[PDB]
């Protein structure tokens, strides 16, 4: 009912970001939604005296044929002064369910002085009419300050539920509310409905994957060459990996498909390498003061591999996505879904989103990514233009 | 007197840390002084300005050309920041289209009172024997940074109700002009136009009777009722060209390319690299002269675009012009274009047709979403199988929207495809190359499983070039199917990027060799790790 004073970081002006082109149906959906939001006083139209603009587009979440308004708050979030609680037990919980609490944010009024920075623009087709401009009178979804401000309120809402059973972990990131537990999915569903109506009144399944080497009865020259390449690669990550007895098999010059029988010393070397690989990595820690880097490799056939790390050859997490949902004919759709899942997991585990490095040209991604995007948050990303040799090594 | 509806002002604030303008007044001639005195007299009589006193410590210079030229340049730096033209091809055809234009656009809109004091200027009295006459603005000044935004916001605010009340008329506001199209009968159209005129008169916005029947000359375009085009393209004729005139020329050709199909700027654009001088004379190759010549050929026959019909599919068709050049036509019906265009490949070391095609499709898609607010169906010179293979085996994620194969050679194709697994019954070439970083001397060659060996000595070369060279040699001397083992991450990287064309002629020759091959398997191994068959001993000599 009262607006907590909010400013920006020292020496930083408000965000000015070009609104990118929108399709017709998205423009229409935004027009309808923003009209209805205007009627409810959530947002108000503004004049030219406001230089600031933040991008906006429209999406569709699954099970919903109704549009949702997605604001890209990245630059504004970066330009807000750091606002001054992470449950490491959330990742340990057997199951975690995600909720959208965004409807609750619109009750809290936004600081009047700060409202000028939340300005956005519904664009028009072919620049025939000037864009419709709005500013938020309440806490906007996607803004980093919104959960921080509603944090206390949310605590007040969750006091009875949390006090009632404290075997249930509750976390909050942006517009999303994550709830972990050990319960059964039926009882979990009933409990989540209980918390849902509890919200009325006022599905995930959570290690760094081991580097594996083939087990073969007979090795070709090619097999051993790939093995040596993978082991040499892994030697960066692991201290004691030695390829010298395996390389001694390749000695002479033979056809790639010719079978080379393993020697005693070579088999021993491979075994020792296996044992070394079975251990975890030496001295791997998570520095909260460092960036999270995510790298994704397209493996083909819907397969994707990823690694989250703060330092080269020290991996905080690794994973693989074969998941097939409506994505078969479309690479970019798959990539977007993968980025979303990796980001979600990153949010659960470390509390924050990773900086992505994407195996896609900038222009392609820039063109098509918003069409497949169902998340309320957005991460940062990079584009790698040089094909990695590590592709085969993470397969 | 009719009570003109008040236009609520726009609050204006100066930039934080900066103060109001203080600048000297120019030594103007007596005639100019008299002229400005008269102008400001009748202006004050109209109520667009008011006289102030010495209290105001803000002054901006003034001149005369009569016409009063007020210089706000030092005010524009002290004034806060305030918040793409419509493309003819996107305009939807209407039965009637009327152009209204407001006179005294900025002077019809009041200025924020608190800011008015900052707009002050002084008229020098003759022989400087009297204090100069002080004046301030009650309305939006000509040449003031805040004028266009405030004016268009006010205008929009006034236009909203008429628009909402009349859904059967379409209205587009640009700057000081209003363009009203409609599909209803001509009489009802004229009536509604007069209605709008009086509606604007309610806020005191004057619009002409009678006007300005088509064709409209607007922003370098000619707008006819059924069709649109560009105003005539004038290509300067000079015996010796200047870089500035090449900027002019390339700009003009670019402007003409949105409608005229087949425009090529590549040579002329290639001649502008690292110039940065307006007087510099540059030569022209036969390719360039022939390019500008055929460009003059294209500009002989005049061509028109049509307007946009939402009822029909939007179709983009692309053709390969060669040398990284692509041309596209966006149309509704066959032979009738909405518009046209071109895409030039980005500066790069290596590349292939498919990538450039993809980039073109992206460009056209963005352009389309801007203009028509939708993605067009594509007609592309690429077989479905070619695209299938390419995108499935590409290390990068890639996608093209809905499209069909049009067969109009040259067709985009995959020239070579590397094997997934080693080839049985195919000779295995272990290649290596190296160079001396001092003497710039090196060797490159191969040894195979059949005993075949070669080592070629090379001058003026680098390690990378010798690795590429070694691969090239393996390709030359091998049969239709070959397995090549290389220790080069560089060469493997390039070849895995799958270029069909390259800056490096060595890479081009390698590509040629690849094209001549039936099956090629390229395997990589760590160097210096003592892999047998991989001979550093020969090339490191
Ligand atoms: N000068 C000028 C000028 C005049 C009209 C503009 C405009 O005109 C329009 C304004 C509103 C609605 C449709 C419009 O044009 C649709 C296409 N079209 C265009 C011309 C014509 O005769 N008939 C026609 O069906 C739309 C955009 C810019 C315009 C600029
Ligand atoms: Mg080499
Ligand atoms: Mg070597």
UniProtKB/Swiss-Prot annotation, chain A:
The gene is gag-pol. Changing residue 203 to A: Complete loss of RNA-dependent DNA polymerase activity. Complete loss of RNA 5'-end and 3'-end cleavages. Changing residue 146 to T: Complete loss of polymerase activity. No loss of RNase H activity. Changing residue 146 to G: Complete loss of polymerase activity. No loss of RNase H activity. Changing residue 175 to N: Strongly decreased RNA-directed and DNA-directed DNA polymerase activities. No effect on RNase H activity. The lineage of its organism: Viruses, Riboviria, Pararnavirae, Artverviricota, Revtraviricetes. Changing residue 146 to A: 74% loss of polymerase activity. 56% loss of RNase H activity. A motif (Tryptophan repeat motif) lies at residues 365-381. It comes from the Viruses. Changing residue 143 to A: 73% loss of DNA-directed DNA polymerase activity. 70% loss of RNA-directed DNA polymerase activity. Changing residue 266 to L: 68% loss of polymerase activity. 10% loss of RNase H activity. Changing residue 368 to F: No effect on RT p66/p51 heterodimerization. Changing residue 377 to L: No effect on RT p66/p51 heterodimerization. Residues 40-204 form the Reverse transcriptase domain. Changing residue 143 to F: 10% loss of DNA-directed DNA polymerase activity. 22% loss of RNA-directed DNA polymerase activity. Changing residue 157 to A: 71% loss of DNA-directed DNA polymerase activity. 61% loss of RNA-directed DNA polymerase activity. The record marks 368, 381 as: Essential for RT p66/p51 heterodimerization. Changing residue 162 to R: In strain: Isolate PV22. It comes from Human immunodeficiency virus type 1 group M subtype B (isolate BH10). Disulfide bonds: none annotated. Changing residue 174 to L: 90% loss of polymerase activity. No loss of RNase H activity. Changing residue 369 to L: No effect on RT p66/p51 heterodimerization. Changing residue 270 to S: 59% loss of polymerase activity. 8% loss of RNase H activity. Changing residue 381 to L: Almost complete loss of RT p66/p51 heterodimerization. This is p51 RT. Changing residue 176 to A: Strongly decreased RNA-directed and DNA-directed DNA polymerase activities. Loss of pyrophosphorolysis (reverse of the polymerase reaction). No effect on RNase H activity. Mg(2+) 1 binds at residues 100, 175-176.
């Amino acid at each position: 009912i009262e607006t907590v004073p909010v400013k920006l970081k020292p020496g930083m002006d408000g965000p000015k970001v070009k609104q990118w082109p929108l399709t017709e149906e998205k423009i229409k959906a935004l027009v309808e939604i923003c009209t209805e939001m205007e009627k409810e006083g959530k947002i108000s139209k503004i004049g030219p005296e406001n230089p600031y603009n933040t991008p906006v587009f429209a999406i569709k979440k699954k099970d919903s044929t109704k549009w949702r308004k997605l604001v890209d708050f990245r630059e504004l979030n970066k330009r807000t002064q750091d606002f001054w609680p992470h449950p490491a037990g959330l990742k340990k919980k057997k199951s975690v369910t995600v909720l959208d609490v965004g409807d609750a944010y619109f009750s809290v009024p936004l600081d009047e002085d700060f409202r000028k920075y939340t300005a956005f623009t519904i664009p028009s087709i072919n620049n025939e009419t000037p864009g419709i401009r709005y500013q938020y009178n309440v806490l906007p979804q996607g803004w980093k300050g919104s959960p921080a401000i509603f944090q206390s309120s949310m605590t007040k809402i969750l006091e009875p539920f949390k006090k009632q059973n404290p075997d249930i972990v509750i976390y909050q990131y942006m517009d999303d509310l994550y709830v972990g537990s050990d319960l059964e999915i039926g009882q979990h569903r009933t409990k989540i409905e209980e918390l849902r109506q509890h919200l009325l009144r006022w599905e995930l399944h959570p290690t760094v994957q081991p580097i594996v080497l083939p087990e073969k009865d007979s090795w070709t020259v090619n097999d051993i060459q790939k093995l040596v390449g993978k082991l040499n690669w892994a030697s960066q990550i692991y201290p004691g990996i030695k390829v010298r007895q395996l390389s001694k098999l390749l000695r002479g010059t033979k056809a790639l498909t010719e079978v080379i029988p393993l020697t005693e010393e070579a088999e021993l070397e491979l075994a020792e390498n296996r044992e070394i690989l079975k251990e975890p990595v030496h001295g791997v820690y998570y520095d909260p003061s460092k960036d999270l880097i995510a790298e994704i490799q397209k493996q083909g056939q819907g397969q994707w591999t990823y690694q989250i790390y703060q330092e080269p050859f020290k991996n905080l997490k690794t994973g693989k996505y074969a998941r097939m949902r409506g994505a078969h004919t479309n690479d970019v759709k798959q990539l977007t879904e993968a980025v979303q899942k990796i980001t979600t997991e990153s949010i659960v585990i470390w509390g924050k989103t990773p900086k992505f490095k994407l195996p896609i040209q900038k222009e392609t991604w820039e063109t098509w990514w918003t069409e497949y995007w169902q998340a309320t948050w957005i991460p940062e990303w990079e584009f790698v233009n040089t094909p990695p040799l590590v592709k085969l090594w993470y397969q | 007197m009719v009570p003109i509806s008040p236009i609520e002002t726009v609050p204006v604030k100066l930039k934080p840390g900066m103060d109001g303008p203080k600048v000297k007044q120019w030594p103007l001639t007596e005639e100019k002084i008299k002229a400005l005195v008269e102008i400001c007299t009748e202006m004050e009589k109209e109520g667009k300005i008011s006289k102030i006193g010495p209290e105001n410590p803000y002054n901006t210079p003034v001149f005369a050309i009569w016409r009063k030229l007020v210089d706000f340049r030092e005010l524009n730096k002290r004034t806060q920041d305030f918040w793409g033209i419509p493309h003819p091809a996107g305009l939807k055809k209407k039965k009637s289209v009327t152009v209204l234009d407001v006179g005294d656009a900025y002077f019809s809109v009041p200025l924020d009172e608190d800011f008015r004091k900052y707009t002050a200027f002084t008229i020098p009295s003759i022989n400087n024997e009297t204090p100069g006459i002080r004046y301030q603005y009650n309305v939006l000044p000509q040449g003031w940074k805040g004028s266009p935004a405030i004016f268009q916001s006010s205008m929009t605010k006034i236009l909203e109700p008429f628009a909402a009340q009349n859904p059967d008329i379409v209205i587009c506001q640009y700057m000081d002009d209003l363009y009203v199209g409609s599909d209803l009968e001509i009489g009802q159209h004229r009536t509604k136009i007069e209605e709008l005129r009086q509606h604007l008169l309610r806020w005191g916005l004057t619009t002409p009777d009678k006007q300005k029947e088509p064709p409209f000359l607007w922003m370098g375009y000619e707008l006819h009722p059924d069709k649109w085009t560009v105003q005539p393209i004038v290509l300067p004729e000079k015996d010796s060209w200047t870089v500035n005139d090449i900027q002019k020329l390339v700009g003009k050709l670019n402007w003409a390319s949105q409608i005229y199909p087949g425009i090529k700027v590549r040579q002329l654009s290639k001649l502008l690299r690292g110039t940065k001088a307006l007087t510099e004379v540059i030569p022209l190759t036969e390719e360039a002269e022939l390019e500008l010549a055929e460009n003059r050929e294209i500009l002989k026959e005049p061509v028109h675009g049509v307007y946009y019909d939402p009822s029909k599919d939007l179709i983009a068709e692309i053709q390969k012009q060669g040398q990284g050049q692509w041309t596209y036509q966006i149309y509704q019906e066959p032979f009738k274009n909405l518009k046209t265009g071109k895409y030039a490949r980005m500066r790069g070391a290596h590349t292939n047709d498919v990538k450039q095609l993809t980039e073109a499709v992206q460009k056209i898609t963005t352009e389309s979403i801007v203009i028509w607010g939708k993605t067009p169906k594509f007609k592309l010179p690429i077989q479905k199988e070619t695209w299938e293979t390419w995108w499935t085996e590409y290390w990068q994620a890639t996608w093209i929207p809905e499209w069909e194969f049009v067969n109009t050679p040259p067709l985009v194709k995959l020239w070579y495809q590397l094997e997934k697994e080693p080839i049985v019954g195919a000779e295995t070439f272990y290649v290596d190359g190296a160079a001396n970083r001092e003497t710039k001397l090196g060797k490159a060659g191969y040894v195979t499983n059949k005993g075949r060996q070669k080592v070629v000595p090379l001058t003026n070369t680098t390690n990378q070039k010798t690795e590429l060279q070694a691969i090239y040699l393996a390709l030359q001397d091998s049969g239709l199917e070959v397995n090549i083992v290389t220790d080069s991450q560089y060469a493997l990287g390039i070849i895995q990027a799958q270029p069909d064309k390259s800056e490096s002629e060595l890479v081009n020759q390698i590509i040629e060799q690849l094209i001549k091959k039936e099956k090629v398997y390229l395997a990589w191994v760590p160097a210096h790790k003592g892999i047998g068959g991989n001979e550093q001993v020969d090339k490191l000599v």
